[PDB]
Amino acid sequence: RGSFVEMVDNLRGKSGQGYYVEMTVGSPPQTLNILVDTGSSNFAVGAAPHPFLHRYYQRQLSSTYRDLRKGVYVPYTQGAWAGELGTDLVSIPHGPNVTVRANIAAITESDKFFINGSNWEGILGLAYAEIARPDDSLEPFFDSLVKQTHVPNLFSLQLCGAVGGSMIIGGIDHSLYTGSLWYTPIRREWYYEVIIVRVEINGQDLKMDCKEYNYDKSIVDSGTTNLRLPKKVFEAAVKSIKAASSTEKFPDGFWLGEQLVCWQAGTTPWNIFPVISLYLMGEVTNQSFRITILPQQYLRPVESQDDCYKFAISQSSTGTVMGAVIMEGFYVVFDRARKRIGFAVSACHVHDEFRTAAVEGPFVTLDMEDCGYN
Ligand SMILES: C[C@@H](NC(=O)c1cc(C(=O)N[C@@H](Cc2ccccc2)[C@@H](O)Cn2cccn2)cc(N(C)S(C)(=O)=O)c1)c1ccc(F)cc1
Numbered sequence: 001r002g003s004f005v006e007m008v009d010n011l012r013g014k015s016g017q018g019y020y021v022e023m024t025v026g027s028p029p030q031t032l033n034i035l036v037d038t039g040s041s042n043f044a045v046g047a048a049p050h051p052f053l054h055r056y057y058q059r060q061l062s063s064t065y066r067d068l069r070k071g072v073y074v075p076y077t078q079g080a081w082a083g084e085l086g087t088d089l090v091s092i093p094h095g096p097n098v099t100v101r102a103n104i105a106a107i108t109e110s111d112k113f114f115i116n117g118s119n120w121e122g123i124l125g126l127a128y129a130e131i132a133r134p135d136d137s138l139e140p141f142f143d144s145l146v147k148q149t150h151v152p153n154l155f156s157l158q159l160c161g162a163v164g165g166s167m168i169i170g171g172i173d174h175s176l177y178t179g180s181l182w183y184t185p186i187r188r189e190w191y192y193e194v195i196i197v198r199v200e201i202n203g204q205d206l207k208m209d210c211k212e213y214n215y216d217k218s219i220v221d222s223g224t225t226n227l228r229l230p231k232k233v234f235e236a237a238v239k240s241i242k243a244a245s246s247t248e249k250f251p252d253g254f255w256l257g258e259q260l261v262c263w264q265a266g267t268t269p270w271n272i273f274p275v276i277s278l279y280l281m282g283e284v285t286n287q288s289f290r291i292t293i294l295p296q297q298y299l300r301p302v303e304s305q306d307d308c309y310k311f312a313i314s315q316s317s318t319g320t321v322m323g324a325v326i327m328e329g330f331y332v333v334f335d336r337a338r339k340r341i342g343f344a345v346s347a348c349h350v351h352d353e354f355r356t357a358a359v360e361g362p363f364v365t366l367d368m369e370d371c372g373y374n
């Protein structure tokens, strides 16, 4: 097919509990399934038995492992782990045709980090060194890949929800999207931080000051399931989504992610729930564009003749997190060489015969440089 064909369809996800790619570490080779996380910057692998791991990295069998004689601990919003730093050879067999010596944290203990049944045994933090632990001197995997090889400084993700998808490393594959790509600047290289300049629920502007949508940051994060919104924005958005979906009433806990609602298999009334649009700053002064997701992205299946769903927009106290809810609508291009992130409608996103996810523009939006937090 296109020149990156052998990286298409290189991601899997088991019951929707994270998308992961196979990575092969050490010598002789040990291949493990690695969750792709654009919200963090450590490459870390299970390296000791755990009840939720089928396999783990055995350093003593790899002749090329080098111990860096330093511990590392990483806490996330969900979960934490502790382990030991070293370096070893790493290749991605359905990724670029190169092998690099990368830092690797060997996870030896953890709390609420591994997910039973998820089939992944480590994490690949693809964001930048500023947020790596123990500190920014520990080079992240993608930085090593670009410094040691010819691979261009860009990767792109198509996360296909319900689970699989593609991680194209070093380019873009045009089969994975339709329409045009539209780009927003990476505001700052730490997380993949972006600026959200307007939010609409079924065409209706939420009308908050744009500084509320980015307080205290907005990031794109493939290792977080939900669209997470700061408190005032979440409360406002729920009020508006309730109002829009008012031909059916749901208990208050459903909008808090505490109750599920189930429909008989195949009857979910998608049409009653609104589309949600986020407008992002564009590449030209005063220009923006909008990405629009469907309830097939923000109502997530929980795995009888019953389709059960959880509402997967939730409250955050650390800014807007555009997680898998947002990314499953779109092919997302992390164009680190041009400090920008591109969105296009994904060729695999879940939709129905009446509505599809969309990426549209340009719009005119003034004073966008004021939306960001300082
Ligand atoms: C793998 C699974 N992920 C979740 O279940 C999940 C993970 C986190 C979280 O902290 N993610 C960490 C990395 C990590 C990866 C794996 C385990 C723990 C943590 C970094 O990305 C952000 N981070 C950096 C510093 C602080 N935080 C938060 C939440 N929520 C808080 S939620 C419920 O979505 O609002 C839910 C998944 C399932 C389906 C998918 F399509 C995609 C992902």
Ligand SMILES: [Cl-]
Pocket (backbone or CB within 6 Å): 177, 178, 179
């Ligand atoms: Cl097209």
